[PDB]
PDB file of C-alpha atoms in Angstrom:
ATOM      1  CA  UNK K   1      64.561  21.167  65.690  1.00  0.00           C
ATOM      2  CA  UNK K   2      63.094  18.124  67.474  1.00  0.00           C
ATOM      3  CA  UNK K   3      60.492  20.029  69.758  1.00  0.00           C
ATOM      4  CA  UNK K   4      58.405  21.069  66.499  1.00  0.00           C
ATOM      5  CA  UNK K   5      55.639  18.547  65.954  1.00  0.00           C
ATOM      6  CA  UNK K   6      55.886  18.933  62.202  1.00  0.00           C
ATOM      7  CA  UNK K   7      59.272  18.181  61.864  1.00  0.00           C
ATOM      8  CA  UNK K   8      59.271  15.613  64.354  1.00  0.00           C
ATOM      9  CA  UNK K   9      56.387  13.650  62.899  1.00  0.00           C
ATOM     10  CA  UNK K  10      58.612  10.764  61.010  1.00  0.00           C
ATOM     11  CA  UNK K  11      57.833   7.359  62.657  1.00  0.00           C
ATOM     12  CA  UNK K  12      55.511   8.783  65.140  1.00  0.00           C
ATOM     13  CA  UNK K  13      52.150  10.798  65.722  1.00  0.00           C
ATOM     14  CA  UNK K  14      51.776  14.448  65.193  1.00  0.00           C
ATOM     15  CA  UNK K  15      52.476  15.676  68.853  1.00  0.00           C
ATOM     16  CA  UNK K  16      51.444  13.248  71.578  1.00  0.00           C
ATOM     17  CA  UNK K  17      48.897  12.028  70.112  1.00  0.00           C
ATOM     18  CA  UNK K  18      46.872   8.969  70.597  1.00  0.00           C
ATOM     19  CA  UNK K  19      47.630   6.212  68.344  1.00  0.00           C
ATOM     20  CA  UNK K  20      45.264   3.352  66.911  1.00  0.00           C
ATOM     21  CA  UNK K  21      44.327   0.900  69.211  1.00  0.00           C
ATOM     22  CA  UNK K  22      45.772  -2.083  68.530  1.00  0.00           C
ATOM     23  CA  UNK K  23      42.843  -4.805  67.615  1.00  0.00           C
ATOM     24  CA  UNK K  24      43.122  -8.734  66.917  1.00  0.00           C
ATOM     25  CA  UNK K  25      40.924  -8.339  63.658  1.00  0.00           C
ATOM     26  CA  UNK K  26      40.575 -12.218  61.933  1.00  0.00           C
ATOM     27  CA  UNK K  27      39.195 -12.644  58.634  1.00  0.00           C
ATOM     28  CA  UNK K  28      38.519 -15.880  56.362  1.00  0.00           C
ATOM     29  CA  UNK K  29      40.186 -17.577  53.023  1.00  0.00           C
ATOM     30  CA  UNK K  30      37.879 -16.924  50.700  1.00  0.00           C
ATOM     31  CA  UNK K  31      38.898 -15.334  47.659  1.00  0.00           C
ATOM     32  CA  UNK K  32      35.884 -13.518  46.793  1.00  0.00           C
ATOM     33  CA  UNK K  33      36.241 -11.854  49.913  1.00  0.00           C
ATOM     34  CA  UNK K  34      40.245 -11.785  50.341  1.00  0.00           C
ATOM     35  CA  UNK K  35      41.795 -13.077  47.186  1.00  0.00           C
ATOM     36  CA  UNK K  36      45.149 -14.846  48.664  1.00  0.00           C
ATOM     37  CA  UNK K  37      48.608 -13.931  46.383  1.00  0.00           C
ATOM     38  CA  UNK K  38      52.379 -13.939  47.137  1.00  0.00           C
ATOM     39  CA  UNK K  39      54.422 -11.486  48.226  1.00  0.00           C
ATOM     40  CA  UNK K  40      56.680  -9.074  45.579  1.00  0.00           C
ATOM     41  CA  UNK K  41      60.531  -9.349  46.422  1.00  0.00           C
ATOM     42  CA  UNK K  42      60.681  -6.043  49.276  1.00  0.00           C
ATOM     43  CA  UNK K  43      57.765  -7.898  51.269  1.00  0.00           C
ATOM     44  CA  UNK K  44      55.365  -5.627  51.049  1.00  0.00           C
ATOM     45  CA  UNK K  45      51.435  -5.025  49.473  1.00  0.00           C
ATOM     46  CA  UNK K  46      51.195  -1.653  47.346  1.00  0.00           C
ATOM     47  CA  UNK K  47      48.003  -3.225  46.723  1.00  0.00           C
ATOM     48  CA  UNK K  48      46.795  -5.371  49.131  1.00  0.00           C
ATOM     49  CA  UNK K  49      47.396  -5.937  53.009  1.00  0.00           C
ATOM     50  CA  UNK K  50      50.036  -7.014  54.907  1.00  0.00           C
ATOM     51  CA  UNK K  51      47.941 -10.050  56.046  1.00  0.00           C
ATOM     52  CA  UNK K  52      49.745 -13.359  57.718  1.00  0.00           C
ATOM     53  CA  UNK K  53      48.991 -17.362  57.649  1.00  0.00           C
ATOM     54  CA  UNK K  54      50.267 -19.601  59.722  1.00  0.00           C
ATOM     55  CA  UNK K  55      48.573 -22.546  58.453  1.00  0.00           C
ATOM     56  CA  UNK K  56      47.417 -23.167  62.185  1.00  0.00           C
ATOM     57  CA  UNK K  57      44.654 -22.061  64.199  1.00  0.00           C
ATOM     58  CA  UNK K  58      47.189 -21.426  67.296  1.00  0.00           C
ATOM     59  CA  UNK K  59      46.269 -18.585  69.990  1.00  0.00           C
ATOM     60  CA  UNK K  60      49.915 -18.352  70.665  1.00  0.00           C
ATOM     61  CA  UNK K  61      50.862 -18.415  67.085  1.00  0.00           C
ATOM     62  CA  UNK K  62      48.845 -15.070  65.989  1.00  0.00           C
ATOM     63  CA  UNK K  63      49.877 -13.502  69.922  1.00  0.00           C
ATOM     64  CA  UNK K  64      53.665 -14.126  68.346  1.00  0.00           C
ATOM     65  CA  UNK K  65      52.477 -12.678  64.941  1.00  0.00           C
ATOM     66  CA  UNK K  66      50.871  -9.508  66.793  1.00  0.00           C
ATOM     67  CA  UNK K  67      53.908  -9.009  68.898  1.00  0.00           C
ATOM     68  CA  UNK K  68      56.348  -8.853  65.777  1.00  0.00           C
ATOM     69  CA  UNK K  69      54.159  -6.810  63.665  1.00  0.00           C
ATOM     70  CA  UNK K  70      53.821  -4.407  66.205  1.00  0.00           C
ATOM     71  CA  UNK K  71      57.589  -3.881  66.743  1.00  0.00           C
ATOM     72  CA  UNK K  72      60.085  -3.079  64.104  1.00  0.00           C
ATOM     73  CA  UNK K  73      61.801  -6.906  64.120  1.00  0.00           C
ATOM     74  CA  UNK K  74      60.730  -8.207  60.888  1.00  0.00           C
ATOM     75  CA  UNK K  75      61.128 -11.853  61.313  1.00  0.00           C
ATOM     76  CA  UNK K  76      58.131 -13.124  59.243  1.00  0.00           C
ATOM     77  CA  UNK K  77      59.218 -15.235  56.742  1.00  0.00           C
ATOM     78  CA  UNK K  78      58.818 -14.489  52.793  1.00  0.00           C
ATOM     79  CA  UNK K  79      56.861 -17.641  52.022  1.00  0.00           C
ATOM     80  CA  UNK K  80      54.599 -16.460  55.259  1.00  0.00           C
ATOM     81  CA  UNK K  81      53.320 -13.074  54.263  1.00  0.00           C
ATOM     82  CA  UNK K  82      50.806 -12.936  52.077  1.00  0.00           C
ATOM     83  CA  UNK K  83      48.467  -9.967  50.299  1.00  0.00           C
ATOM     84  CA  UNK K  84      45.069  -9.760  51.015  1.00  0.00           C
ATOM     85  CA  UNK K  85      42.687  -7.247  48.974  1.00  0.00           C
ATOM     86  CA  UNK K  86      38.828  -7.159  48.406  1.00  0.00           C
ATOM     87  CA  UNK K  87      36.034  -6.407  49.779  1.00  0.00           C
ATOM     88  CA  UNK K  88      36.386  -7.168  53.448  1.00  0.00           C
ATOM     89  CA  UNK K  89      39.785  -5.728  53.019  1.00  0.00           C
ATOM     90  CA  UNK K  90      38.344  -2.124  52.011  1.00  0.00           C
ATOM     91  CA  UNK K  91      35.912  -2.239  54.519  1.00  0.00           C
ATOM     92  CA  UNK K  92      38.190  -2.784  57.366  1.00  0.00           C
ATOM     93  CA  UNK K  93      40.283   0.228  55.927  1.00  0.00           C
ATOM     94  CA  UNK K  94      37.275   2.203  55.968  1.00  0.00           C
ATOM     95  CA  UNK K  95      36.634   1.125  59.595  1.00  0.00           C
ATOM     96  CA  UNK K  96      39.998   2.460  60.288  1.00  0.00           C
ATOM     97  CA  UNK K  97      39.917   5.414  58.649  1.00  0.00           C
ATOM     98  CA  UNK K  98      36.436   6.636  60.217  1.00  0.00           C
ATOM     99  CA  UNK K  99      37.081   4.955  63.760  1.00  0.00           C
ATOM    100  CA  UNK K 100      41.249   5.234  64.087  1.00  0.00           C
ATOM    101  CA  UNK K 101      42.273   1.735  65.464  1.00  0.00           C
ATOM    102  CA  UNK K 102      44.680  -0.256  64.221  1.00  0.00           C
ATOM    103  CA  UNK K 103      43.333  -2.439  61.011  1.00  0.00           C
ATOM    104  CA  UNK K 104      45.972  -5.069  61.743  1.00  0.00           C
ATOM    105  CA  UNK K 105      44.687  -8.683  59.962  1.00  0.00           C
ATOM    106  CA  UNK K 106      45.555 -12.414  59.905  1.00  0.00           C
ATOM    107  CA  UNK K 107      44.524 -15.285  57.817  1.00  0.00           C
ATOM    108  CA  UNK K 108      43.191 -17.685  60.229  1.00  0.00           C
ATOM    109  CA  UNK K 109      44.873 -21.420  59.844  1.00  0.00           C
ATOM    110  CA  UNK K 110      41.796 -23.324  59.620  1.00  0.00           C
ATOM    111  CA  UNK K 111      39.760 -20.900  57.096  1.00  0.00           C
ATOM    112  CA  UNK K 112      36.294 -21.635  57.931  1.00  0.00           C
ATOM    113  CA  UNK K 113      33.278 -20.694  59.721  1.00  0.00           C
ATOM    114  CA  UNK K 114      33.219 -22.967  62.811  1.00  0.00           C
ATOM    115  CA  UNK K 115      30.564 -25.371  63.842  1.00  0.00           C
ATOM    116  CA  UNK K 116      29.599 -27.312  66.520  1.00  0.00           C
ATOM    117  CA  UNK K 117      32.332 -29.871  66.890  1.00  0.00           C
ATOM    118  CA  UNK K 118      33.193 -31.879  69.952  1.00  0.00           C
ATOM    119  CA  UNK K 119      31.524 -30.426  71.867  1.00  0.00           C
ATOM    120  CA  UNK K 120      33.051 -26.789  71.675  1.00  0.00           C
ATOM    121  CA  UNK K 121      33.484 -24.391  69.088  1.00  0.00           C
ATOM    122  CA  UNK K 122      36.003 -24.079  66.502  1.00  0.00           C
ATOM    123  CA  UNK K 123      37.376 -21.528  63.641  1.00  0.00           C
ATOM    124  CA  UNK K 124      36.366 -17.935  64.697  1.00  0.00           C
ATOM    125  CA  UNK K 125      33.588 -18.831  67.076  1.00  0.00           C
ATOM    126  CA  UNK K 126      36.558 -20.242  69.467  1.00  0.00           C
ATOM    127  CA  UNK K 127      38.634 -17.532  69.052  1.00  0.00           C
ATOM    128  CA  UNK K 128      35.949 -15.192  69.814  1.00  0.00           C
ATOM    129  CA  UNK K 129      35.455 -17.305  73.274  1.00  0.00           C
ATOM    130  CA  UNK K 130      38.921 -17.585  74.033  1.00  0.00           C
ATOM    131  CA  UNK K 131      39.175 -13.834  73.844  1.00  0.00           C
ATOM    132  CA  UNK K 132      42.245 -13.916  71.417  1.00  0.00           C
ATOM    133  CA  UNK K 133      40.664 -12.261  68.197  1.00  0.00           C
ATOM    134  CA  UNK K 134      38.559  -8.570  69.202  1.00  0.00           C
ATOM    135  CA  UNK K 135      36.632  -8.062  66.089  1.00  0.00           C
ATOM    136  CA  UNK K 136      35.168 -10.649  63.285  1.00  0.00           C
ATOM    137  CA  UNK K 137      34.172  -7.731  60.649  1.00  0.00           C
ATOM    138  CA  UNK K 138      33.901 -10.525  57.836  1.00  0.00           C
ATOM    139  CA  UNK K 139      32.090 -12.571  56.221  1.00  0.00           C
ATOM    140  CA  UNK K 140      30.196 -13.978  58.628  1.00  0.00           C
ATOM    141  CA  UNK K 141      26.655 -15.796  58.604  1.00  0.00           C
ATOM    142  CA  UNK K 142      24.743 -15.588  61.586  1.00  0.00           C
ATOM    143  CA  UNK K 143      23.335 -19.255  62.954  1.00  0.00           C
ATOM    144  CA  UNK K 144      20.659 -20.152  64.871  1.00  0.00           C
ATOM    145  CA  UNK K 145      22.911 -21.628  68.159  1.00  0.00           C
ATOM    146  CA  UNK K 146      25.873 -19.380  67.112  1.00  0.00           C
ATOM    147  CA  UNK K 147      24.526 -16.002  67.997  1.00  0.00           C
ATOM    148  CA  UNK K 148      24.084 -17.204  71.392  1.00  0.00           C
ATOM    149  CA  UNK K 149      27.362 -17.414  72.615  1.00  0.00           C
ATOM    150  CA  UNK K 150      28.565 -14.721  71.528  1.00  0.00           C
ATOM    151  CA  UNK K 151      27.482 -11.341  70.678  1.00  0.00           C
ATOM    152  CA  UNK K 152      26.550 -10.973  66.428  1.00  0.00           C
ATOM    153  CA  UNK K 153      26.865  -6.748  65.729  1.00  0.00           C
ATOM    154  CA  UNK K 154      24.630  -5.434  63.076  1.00  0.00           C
ATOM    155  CA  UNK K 155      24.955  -7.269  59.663  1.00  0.00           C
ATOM    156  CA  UNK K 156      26.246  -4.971  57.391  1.00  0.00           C
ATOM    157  CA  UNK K 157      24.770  -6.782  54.283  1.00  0.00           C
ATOM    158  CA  UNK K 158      21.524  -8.959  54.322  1.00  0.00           C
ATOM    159  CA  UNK K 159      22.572 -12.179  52.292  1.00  0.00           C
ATOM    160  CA  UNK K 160      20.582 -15.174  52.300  1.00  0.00           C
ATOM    161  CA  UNK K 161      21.501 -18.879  51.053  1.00  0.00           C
ATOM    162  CA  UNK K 162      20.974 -19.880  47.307  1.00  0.00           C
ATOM    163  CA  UNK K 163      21.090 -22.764  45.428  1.00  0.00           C
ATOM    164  CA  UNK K 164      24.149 -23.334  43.284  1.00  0.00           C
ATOM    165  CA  UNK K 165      23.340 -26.176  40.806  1.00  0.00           C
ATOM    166  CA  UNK K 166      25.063 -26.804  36.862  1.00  0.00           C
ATOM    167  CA  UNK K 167      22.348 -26.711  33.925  1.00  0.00           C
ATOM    168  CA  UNK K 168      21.980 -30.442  32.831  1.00  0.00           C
ATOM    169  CA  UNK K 169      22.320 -30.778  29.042  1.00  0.00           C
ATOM    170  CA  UNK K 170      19.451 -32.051  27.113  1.00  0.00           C
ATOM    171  CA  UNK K 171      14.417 -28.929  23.036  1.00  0.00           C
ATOM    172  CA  UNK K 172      15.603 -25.656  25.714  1.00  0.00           C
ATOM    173  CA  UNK K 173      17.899 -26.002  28.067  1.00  0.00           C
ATOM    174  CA  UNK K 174      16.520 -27.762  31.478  1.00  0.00           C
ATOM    175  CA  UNK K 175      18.239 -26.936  34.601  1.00  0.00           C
ATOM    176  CA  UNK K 176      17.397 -28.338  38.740  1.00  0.00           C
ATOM    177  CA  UNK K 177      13.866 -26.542  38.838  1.00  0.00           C
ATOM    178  CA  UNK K 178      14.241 -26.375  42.883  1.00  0.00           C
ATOM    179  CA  UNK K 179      12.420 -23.711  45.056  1.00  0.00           C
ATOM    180  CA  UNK K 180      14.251 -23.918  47.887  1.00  0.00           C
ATOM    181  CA  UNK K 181      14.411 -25.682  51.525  1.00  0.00           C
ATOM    182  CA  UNK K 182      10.546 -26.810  51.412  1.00  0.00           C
ATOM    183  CA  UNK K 183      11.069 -29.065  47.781  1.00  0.00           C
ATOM    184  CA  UNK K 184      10.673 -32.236  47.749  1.00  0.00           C
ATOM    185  CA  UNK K 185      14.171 -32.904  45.379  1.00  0.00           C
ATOM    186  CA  UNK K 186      15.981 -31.045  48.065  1.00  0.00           C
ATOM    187  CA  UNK K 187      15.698 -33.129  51.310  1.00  0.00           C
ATOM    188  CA  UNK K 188      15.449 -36.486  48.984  1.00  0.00           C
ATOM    189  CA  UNK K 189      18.463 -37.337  46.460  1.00  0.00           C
ATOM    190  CA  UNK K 190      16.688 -36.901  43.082  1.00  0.00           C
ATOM    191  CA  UNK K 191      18.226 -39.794  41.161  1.00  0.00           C
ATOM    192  CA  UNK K 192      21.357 -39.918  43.176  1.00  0.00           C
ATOM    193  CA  UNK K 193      21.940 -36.164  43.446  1.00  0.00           C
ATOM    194  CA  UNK K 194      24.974 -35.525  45.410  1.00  0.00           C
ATOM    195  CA  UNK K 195      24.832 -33.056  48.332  1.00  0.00           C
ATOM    196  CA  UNK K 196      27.513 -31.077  49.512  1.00  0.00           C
ATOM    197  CA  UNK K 197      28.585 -27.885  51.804  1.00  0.00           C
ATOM    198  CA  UNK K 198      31.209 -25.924  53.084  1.00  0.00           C
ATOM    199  CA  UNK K 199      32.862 -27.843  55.730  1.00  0.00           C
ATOM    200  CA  UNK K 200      32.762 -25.763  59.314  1.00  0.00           C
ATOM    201  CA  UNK K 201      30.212 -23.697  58.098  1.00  0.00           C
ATOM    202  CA  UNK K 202      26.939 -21.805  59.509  1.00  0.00           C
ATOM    203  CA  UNK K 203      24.834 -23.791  56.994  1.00  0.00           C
ATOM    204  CA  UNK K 204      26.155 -27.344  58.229  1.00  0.00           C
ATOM    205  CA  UNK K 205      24.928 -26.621  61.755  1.00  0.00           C
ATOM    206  CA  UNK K 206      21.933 -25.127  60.116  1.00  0.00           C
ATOM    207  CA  UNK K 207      21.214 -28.833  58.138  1.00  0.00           C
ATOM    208  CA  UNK K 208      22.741 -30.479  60.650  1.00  0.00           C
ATOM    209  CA  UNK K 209      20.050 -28.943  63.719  1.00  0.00           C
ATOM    210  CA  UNK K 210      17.361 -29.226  61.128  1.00  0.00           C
ATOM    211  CA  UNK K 211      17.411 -31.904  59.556  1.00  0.00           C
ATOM    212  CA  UNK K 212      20.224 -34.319  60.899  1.00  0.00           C
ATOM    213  CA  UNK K 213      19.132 -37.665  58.442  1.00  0.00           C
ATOM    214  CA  UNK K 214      20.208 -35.979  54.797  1.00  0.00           C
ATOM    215  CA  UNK K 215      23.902 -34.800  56.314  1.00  0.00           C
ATOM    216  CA  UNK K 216      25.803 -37.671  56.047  1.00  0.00           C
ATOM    217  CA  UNK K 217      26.620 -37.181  51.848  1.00  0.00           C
ATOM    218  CA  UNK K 218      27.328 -33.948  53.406  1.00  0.00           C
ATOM    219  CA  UNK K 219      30.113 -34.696  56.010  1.00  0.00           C
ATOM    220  CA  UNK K 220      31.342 -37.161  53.181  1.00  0.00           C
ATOM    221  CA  UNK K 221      31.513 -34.641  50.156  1.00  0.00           C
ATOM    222  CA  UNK K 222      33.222 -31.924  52.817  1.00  0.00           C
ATOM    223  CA  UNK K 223      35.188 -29.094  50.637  1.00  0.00           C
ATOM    224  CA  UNK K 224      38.310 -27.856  51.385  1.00  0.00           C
ATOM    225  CA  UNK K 225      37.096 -24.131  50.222  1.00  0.00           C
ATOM    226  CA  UNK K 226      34.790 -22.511  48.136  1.00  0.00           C
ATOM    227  CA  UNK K 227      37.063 -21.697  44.892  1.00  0.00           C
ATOM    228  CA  UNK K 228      37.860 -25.169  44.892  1.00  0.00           C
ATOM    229  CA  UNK K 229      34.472 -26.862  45.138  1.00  0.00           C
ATOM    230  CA  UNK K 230      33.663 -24.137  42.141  1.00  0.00           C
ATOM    231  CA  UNK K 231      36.651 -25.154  40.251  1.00  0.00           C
ATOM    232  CA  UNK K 232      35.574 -29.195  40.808  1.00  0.00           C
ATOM    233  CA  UNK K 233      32.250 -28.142  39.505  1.00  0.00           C
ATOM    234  CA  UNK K 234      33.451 -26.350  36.644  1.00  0.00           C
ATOM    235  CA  UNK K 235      35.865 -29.692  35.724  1.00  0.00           C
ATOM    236  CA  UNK K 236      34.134 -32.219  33.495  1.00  0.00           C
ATOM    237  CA  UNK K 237      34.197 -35.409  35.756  1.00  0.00           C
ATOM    238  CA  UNK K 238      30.895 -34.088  37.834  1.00  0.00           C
ATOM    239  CA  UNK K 239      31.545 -35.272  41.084  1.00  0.00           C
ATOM    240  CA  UNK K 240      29.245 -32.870  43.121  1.00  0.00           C
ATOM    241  CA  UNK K 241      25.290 -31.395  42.441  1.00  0.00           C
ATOM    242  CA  UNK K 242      24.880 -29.524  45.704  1.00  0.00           C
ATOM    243  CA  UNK K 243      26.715 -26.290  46.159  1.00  0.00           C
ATOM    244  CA  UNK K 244      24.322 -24.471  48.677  1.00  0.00           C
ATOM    245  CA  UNK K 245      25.646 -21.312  50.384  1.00  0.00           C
ATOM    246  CA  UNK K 246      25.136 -17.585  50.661  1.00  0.00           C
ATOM    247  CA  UNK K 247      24.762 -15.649  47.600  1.00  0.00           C
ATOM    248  CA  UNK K 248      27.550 -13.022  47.998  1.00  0.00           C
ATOM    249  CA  UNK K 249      30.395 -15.491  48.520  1.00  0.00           C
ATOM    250  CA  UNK K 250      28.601 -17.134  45.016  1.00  0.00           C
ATOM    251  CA  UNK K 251      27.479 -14.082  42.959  1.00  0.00           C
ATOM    252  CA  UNK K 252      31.071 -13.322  42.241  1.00  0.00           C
ATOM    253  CA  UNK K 253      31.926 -17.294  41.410  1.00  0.00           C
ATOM    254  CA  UNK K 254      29.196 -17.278  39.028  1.00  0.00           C
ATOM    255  CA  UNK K 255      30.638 -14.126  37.243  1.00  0.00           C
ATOM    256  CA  UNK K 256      33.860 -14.633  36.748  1.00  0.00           C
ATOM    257  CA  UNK K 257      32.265 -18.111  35.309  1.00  0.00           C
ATOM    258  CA  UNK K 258      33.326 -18.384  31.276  1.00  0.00           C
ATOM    259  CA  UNK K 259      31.161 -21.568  31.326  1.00  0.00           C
ATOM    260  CA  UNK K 260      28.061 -20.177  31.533  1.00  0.00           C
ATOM    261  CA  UNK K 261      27.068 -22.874  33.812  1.00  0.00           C
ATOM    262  CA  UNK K 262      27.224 -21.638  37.494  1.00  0.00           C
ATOM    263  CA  UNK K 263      24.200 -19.928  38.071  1.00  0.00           C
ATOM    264  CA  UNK K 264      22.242 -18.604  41.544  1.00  0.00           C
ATOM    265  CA  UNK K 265      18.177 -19.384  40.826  1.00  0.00           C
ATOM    266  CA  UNK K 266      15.368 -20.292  43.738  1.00  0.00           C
ATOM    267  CA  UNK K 267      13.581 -17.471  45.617  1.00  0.00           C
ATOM    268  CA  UNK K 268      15.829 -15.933  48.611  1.00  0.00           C
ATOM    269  CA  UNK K 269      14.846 -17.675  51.603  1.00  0.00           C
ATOM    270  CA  UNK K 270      16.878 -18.659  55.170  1.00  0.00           C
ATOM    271  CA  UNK K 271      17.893 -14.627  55.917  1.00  0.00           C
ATOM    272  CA  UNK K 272      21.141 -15.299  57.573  1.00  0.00           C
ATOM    273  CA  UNK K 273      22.548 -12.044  57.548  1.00  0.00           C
ATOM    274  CA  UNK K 274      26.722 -11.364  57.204  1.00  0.00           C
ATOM    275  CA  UNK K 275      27.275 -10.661  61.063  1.00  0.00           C
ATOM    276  CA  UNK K 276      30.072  -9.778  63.058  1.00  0.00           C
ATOM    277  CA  UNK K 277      31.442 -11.577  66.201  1.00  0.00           C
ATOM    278  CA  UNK K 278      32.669  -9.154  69.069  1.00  0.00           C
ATOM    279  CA  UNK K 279      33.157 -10.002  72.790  1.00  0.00           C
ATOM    280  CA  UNK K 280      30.497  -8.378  75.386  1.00  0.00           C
ATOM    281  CA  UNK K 281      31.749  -5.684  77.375  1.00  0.00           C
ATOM    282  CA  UNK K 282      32.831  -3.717  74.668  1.00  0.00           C
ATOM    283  CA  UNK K 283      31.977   0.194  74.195  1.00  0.00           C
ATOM    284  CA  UNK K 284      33.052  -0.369  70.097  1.00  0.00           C
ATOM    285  CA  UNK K 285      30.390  -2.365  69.517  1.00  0.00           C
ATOM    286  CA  UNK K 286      28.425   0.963  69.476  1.00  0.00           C
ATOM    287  CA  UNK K 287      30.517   2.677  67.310  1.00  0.00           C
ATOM    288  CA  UNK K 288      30.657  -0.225  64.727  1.00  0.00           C
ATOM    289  CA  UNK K 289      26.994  -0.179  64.425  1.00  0.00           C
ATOM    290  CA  UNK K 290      26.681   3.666  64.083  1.00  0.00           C
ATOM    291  CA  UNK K 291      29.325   2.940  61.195  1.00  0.00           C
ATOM    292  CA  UNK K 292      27.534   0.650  59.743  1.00  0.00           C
ATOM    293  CA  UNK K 293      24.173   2.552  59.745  1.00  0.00           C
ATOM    294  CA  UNK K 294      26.150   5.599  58.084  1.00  0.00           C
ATOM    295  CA  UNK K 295      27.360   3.572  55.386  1.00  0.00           C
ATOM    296  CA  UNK K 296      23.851   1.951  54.833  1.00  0.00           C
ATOM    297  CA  UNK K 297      22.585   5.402  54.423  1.00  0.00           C
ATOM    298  CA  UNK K 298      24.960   7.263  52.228  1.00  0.00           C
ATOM    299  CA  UNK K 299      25.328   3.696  50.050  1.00  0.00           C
ATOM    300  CA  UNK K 300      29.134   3.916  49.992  1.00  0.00           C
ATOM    301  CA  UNK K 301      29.424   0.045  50.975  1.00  0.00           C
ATOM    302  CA  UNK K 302      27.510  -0.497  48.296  1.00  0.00           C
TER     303      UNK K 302
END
């Protein structure tokens, strides 16, 4: 007793055995992706993950988080832990399960992508360059002056940017007949049509790189998140016409819609692609991709 591996094998490996690597894995707030809940009354997620917010975008606040996961302290507050399931969720368990390293993941404070702002970078895109967070499997759209600085890996799905507009009441139905970023109604306000975005996000530094005259209504009309711009365009008082941004974050939004009135139209266009941030110097990045290819193949992300 106690030299057997089998019977030894309680809070530790088999015999010796090389344990997961212990990665800073960061993920968004978006509840398509990671739906965001409360904690049951043992602090724990039969369901979900064990995923922390700090409500603050602090490089010593997630090393602290990291350091008490990793030991046996439990000091994290109830109020603090939340339960994070979907599909990023899945796929970073799948990642673990097929790669063995440690699927450990925070809710970033800020929630967003991370534009150009000040001069520097913010959201993930700083905590990439810091060297803080080691993986950004999430999602994740790549930008024109974003892959640059840091290294994108293979984008797992290929999502592009739709058009989210309400059908106007009216003798058929008529609805925002737009066909993307070369209309005329799109760069122009069409009889005062509002335009808004995700704030942070890669399609503000998209607009704003592009086309830098039209983004003022959209630094105005900045979001807090995507369920609740889709919940202020689902309220009567319409206070926004623009709701442009990728289709996956939005095909589940208009789903779940019992309006009828949140729909995706206009021809795909602007292939960003749902990339993933990872330092250089990194043999993993390898591995992620071969991953990724697999699961393309055999159609089990799907």
């Amino acid at each position: 007793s106690g030299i057997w591996p089998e019977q030894a094998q309680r809070h530790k490996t088999h015999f010796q055995h090389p344990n997961k690597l212990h990665l800073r894995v960061v993920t968004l707030i978006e509840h398509p992706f990671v739906f965001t809940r409360e904690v049951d009354d043992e602090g724990l997620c039969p369901a979900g993950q064990l995923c922390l917010d700090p409500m603050t975008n602090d490089s010593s606040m997630l090393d602290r988080l990291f350091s008490s996961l990793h030991s046996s302290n439990d000091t994290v507050p109830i109020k603090f832990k939340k339960c994070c399931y979907g599909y990023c969720i899945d796929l970073l368990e799948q990642l673990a399960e097929d790669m063995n390293f440690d699927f450990d993941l925070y809710i970033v404070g800020d929630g967003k992508y991370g534009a150009w702002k000040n001069g520097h970078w913010t959201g993930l895109v700083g905590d990439l360059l810091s060297g803080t967070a080691n993986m950004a499997v999430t999602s994740f759209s790549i930008n024109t002056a974003r892959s640059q600085v840091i290294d994108f890996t293979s984008p797992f799905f290929s999502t592009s940017l739709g058009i989210l507009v309400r059908t106007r009441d009216t003798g058929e139905k008529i609805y925002e007949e737009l066909s993307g970023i070369h209309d005329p109604k799109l760069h122009h306000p069409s009889q005062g049509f509002r335009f808004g975005t995700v704030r942070e996000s890669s399609a503000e530094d998209y607009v704003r790189q592009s086309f830098p005259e039209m983004h003022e209504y959209m630094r105005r009309y900045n979001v807090p998140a995507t369920p609740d711009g889709v919940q202020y365009l689902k309220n009567d008082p319409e206070k926004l016409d623009a709701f442009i941004m990728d289709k996956a974050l939005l095909d589940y939004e208009v789903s779940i819609d019992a309006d009828c009135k949140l729909l995706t139209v206009g021809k795909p266009f602007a292939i960003e692609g749902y990339g993933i941030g990872l330092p250089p110097n990194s043999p993993l990045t390898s591995n992620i991709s071969e991953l990724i290819s697999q699961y393309k193949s055999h159609g089990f992300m799907d």
